[PDB]
Amino acid sequence: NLTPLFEELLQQCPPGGQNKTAHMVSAYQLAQGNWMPTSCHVFMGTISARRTKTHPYEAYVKLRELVEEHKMKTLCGSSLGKHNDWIIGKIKYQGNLRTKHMLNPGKVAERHNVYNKTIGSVMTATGIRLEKLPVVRAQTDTTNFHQAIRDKIDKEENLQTPGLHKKLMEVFNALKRPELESSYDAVEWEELERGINRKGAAGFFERKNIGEILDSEKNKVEEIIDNLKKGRNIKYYETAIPKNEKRDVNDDWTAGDFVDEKKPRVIQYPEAKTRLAITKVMYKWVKQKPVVIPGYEGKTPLFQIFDKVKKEWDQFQNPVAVSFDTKAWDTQVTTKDLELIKDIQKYYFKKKWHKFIDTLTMHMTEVPVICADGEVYIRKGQRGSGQPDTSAGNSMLNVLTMVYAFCEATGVPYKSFDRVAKIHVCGDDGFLITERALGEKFASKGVQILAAAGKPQKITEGDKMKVAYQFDDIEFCSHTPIQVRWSDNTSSYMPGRNTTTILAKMATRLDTIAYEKAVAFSFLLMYSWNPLIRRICLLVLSTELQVKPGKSTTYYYEGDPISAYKEVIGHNLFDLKRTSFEKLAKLNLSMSVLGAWTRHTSKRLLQDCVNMGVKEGNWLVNADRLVSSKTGNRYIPGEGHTLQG
């Protein structure tokens, strides 16, 4: 017989759930005969069968090949990353993504923009053709979306020069802050929850959102935080959706409608529980609570971005400004990069939390991404746009690279950098200010030094970087400095943009007079230099003064808007005596070329304001310097303040 040898193997064939769905044969009944396996896992002494007339040896022949098969797949395989192997389970279909430079194992089982009633109506009444105004919320087809991944996302990590990331540390070793070293730690549930979008998007396998995760399974996030701190691999996946998909939702407050506009076609975001797990821990770094990365303006509000800068620009014997057009930055992040920012995080975080960093970064190098339609792909490094670390990390990266490029092109020591240039960034977008001498070197030798670093500039001109020679040619956060002159003869620069582009952003929604006002106040803080837009905002704010403003847009106001504006701008809207002559030409010209306004549109808006603030009394529209001037009245405003979120 053969049983005494069948008992040998069975104490080695793997365990299983005793399943009655078929024929579980006996530890000896195998040597009987005609009882050959069709499956292996043992139920404390059974396997499958087939009644296939097998010989008491043909059984052992077959089974032992399954044990060889099992001891093979398991234990003694490859692919899909060394930590990401879990994702093979959730596959069901073979995958059509046609990706040439990264994996693609299969697929899984799988917001219109409307007009602002009041604000739109205001515009038309003056001659503004909304038909002739840019569309600023277009979506994208999935056919087009699929090609967006191949065109932009599937690529091998750029070639970053030998011993570069040592020089980048060499750089960060100048701008480090020993006063905070090994100090950061997790934040409590209140400080995290204070500013948090209760409707923050959920991962592909999730069903609740940021709020509900907070409401109910707060302990589930405490798990993700524990294991990561202890050193364990966590099921890290990212989800990928197109831009302006219903699930493109910011967990933090945007200081402008430009942030969601400097977004990439392809948004990659981790499970919402995982967004919290990272953030209750890395809050001090990711939000950048103390600000550590020099020149990071992501916490600065838009109205002072340029006021603050012109205080620097006005110090250089002869200053120039140079821009950073990194071609689709996010897909230009190598794995040594993410390992650099990793070391940084560990410079400021405590000792207990390094493992967290150590672990989380490992996952962030080999990232499985599930698409909207189920098509999972593996990302070759790079930054997912919706990761908590995006603004925080990306920015550190930008200055370190760009410092490196600036010193590498000019020979200025990394230590002596602040003595010869100033740097402002905002994630990947930024610029740098220095003398005409130095700027020109960095301007030409820059496209090269930078492509050499894996951060390739755009197509540009003759391979020179973008150089701003006069201050009001700078671009930043998608706005440009325009200058205003006040009652008291002072100058001060405001955040300029194109009139058409503002009217487009302002009239449109995304699937409510109180909201329409909060928009017109939020637009006034930035665009009061633009009289067409100033007069519009006053005309809207002055409607339905009963109705308190809404709170879902960038800013809003508590009390008398013209007093709130005063609190944040440091000047009364009435004090706006003149807007820069030439710079207002440029930003208004788009309007004549698209034909969005008429000869009569300028005067007609003003007349509506004078027609309104002429009746005896204290009328909002009279906040405009000229309106009040020809309407004889003035606006006497009560206590008012500015808020956000």
Domain boundaries, the chain: 3-73, 117-130+480-644, 142-471
Distance of CA 457 to CAs 323, 409, 449, 465, Å?
Answer: 10, 15, 10, 8
- Burial of 186-218, coded b for 16+ CB within 10 Å and e otherwise, reads bbeeeebbeebeeebbbbbeeeebbeebbeeee
Distance CA 504, CA 510 (A): 13
> Looking at residue 386, what DSSP letter applies?
T
Residues in a beta bridge with 378: 368
The position carrying tokens 């010869």 is 420
Distance CA 105, CA 107 (A): 7
Largest CA distance in the chain: 116
CB 644 within 8 A of CB 556: yes
Distance CA 168, CA 254 (A): 29
CB 446 within 8 A of CB 457: yes
CB 237 within 8 A of CB 270: yes
CB 197 within 8 A of CB 252: yes
Resolution of the PDB structure in angstroms: 3.4
Distance CA 623, CA 634 (A): 7
Name which of 64, 58, 79, 88 is nearest 14 in CA terms.
Answer: 64
Both tokens of residue 561? 């808007």
Q: Which helix (H) or strand (E) holds 423?
A: strand 421-426
- List, in order, residues 6 or more apart from 15 with CB less than 8 Å away: 41, 42
Distance CA 478, CA 456 (A): 20
Strand-pair category, 480-486 with 266-270: unpaired
CB 405 within 8 A of CB 449: yes
**First-to-last C-alpha distance (Å) of the chain:** 80
> Looking at residue 287, what DSSP letter applies?
I
Decide: residue 112, CB within 10 A, 0-12 exposed, 13-18 middle, 19+ buried.
exposed
Q: Other C-beta atoms within 10 Å of 491: how many?
A: 11
- Burial of 415-449, coded b for 16+ CB within 10 Å and e otherwise, reads eebeebbbbbbbbbbbbbbbeeebbbebbebbbeb
Angle at 575 between CA 573 and CA 578, to 5 degrees: 100
CB 379 within 8 A of CB 415: no
Q: How many residues would you count in the chain? A: 645
Backbone region of residue 98 per phi and psi (left: phi > 0; alpha: psi in -120 to 50; beta: other values): left
CB 198 within 8 A of CB 216: no
